[PDB]
Design a protein around this ligand. Sequence first.
Ligand code: MG
Lengths: 140, 67
Amino acid sequence: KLGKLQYSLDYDFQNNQLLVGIIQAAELPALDMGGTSDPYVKVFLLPDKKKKFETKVHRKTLNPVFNEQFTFKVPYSELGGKTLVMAVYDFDRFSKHDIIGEFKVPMNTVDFGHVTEEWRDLQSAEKEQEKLGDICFSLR
Amino acid sequence: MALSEIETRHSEIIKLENSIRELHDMFMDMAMLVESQGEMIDRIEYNVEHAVDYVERAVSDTKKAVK
Ligand SMILES: [Mg+2]
């Protein structure tokens, strides 16, 4: 309900690197005072959360246009089992930056060869039990 | 990039190779024609020198004939 996100995806086989472009976003819900939020998008490889990339902060727009580009130096063999995460955050100067949305893209569903660029609907990020342990015994 | 970029790259490259090949063949034909024409010039110069000899002897004879 927050809005949609237009992004670009393609792989450069000449340098063996992933080219992820953040085009823009639309119809984002407002969380700030003026009637518009201050959005910025954090993008990182889904498999390992290392070297996350963040875009510049846009002031008071529910339709931010970033038109930015990020490069993930990852071989083509490892790429297949690697996912992409694009999460939209709301900037706040005096508090925690609340997450507006998130989107995950499996690299086995992605087809490289033609330059991909699409709009995808944003969804609410996941917050389960912490322990995840089990004990087995018998009663008689 | 993608497979489209690589494919177009490959295509334009092949195009370049064919243009290059046509250039090559043109140069070959050039050398050929120039050579054959060279032989033609050989026989021309031959005939001309013979003509010069004949003319010279003729002129000598007439020059001795008039006086
Ligand atoms: Mg704010």
